[PDB]
Nucleic acid binder design. Structure first.
Length: 97
RNA sequence: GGGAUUUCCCCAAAUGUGGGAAACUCCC
């Protein structure tokens, strides 16, 4: 657990993930992120606005110490499809990868 | 004949939920 969080890193506890399947469970990302720490919850979505077509979700970790590892393994596969991880806010700074 | 898994397309074209369509494997 972080000893000195701020309302700026508080939002980083939530990462945005994309290229997810159209029906993958929120549960299937938690057992996957179990390799980068421990996760609090997941939020699947069905809005497209892009070629991923309902293929996105959000993931919230119980601690920030899981955040930098969750973004580092990015590009792994789950339930038959590749998945990406970006912090919701640093999504644009992480797009340089 | 029924049930389970993923995929693709349109408005805009990568975010907290529009709609439609396609394929494989598995179970009864």
């Amino acid at each position: 657990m972080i000893d000195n969080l701020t309302p700026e890193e508080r939002d980083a506890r939530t990462v945005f993930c994309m290229q997810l399947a159209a029906r993958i469970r929120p549960r299937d990302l938690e057992e996957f992120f179990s390799t980068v720490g421990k996760v609090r919850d997941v939020r699947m979505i069905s809005d497209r606005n892009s070629r991923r077509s309902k293929g996105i979700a959000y993931v919230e970790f119980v601690d920030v110490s899981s955040v930098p590892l969750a973004i580092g393994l990015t590009g792994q596969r789950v339930l038959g499809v590749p998945i990406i991880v970006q912090a919701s806010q640093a999504e644009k700074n992480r797009a340089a990868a």
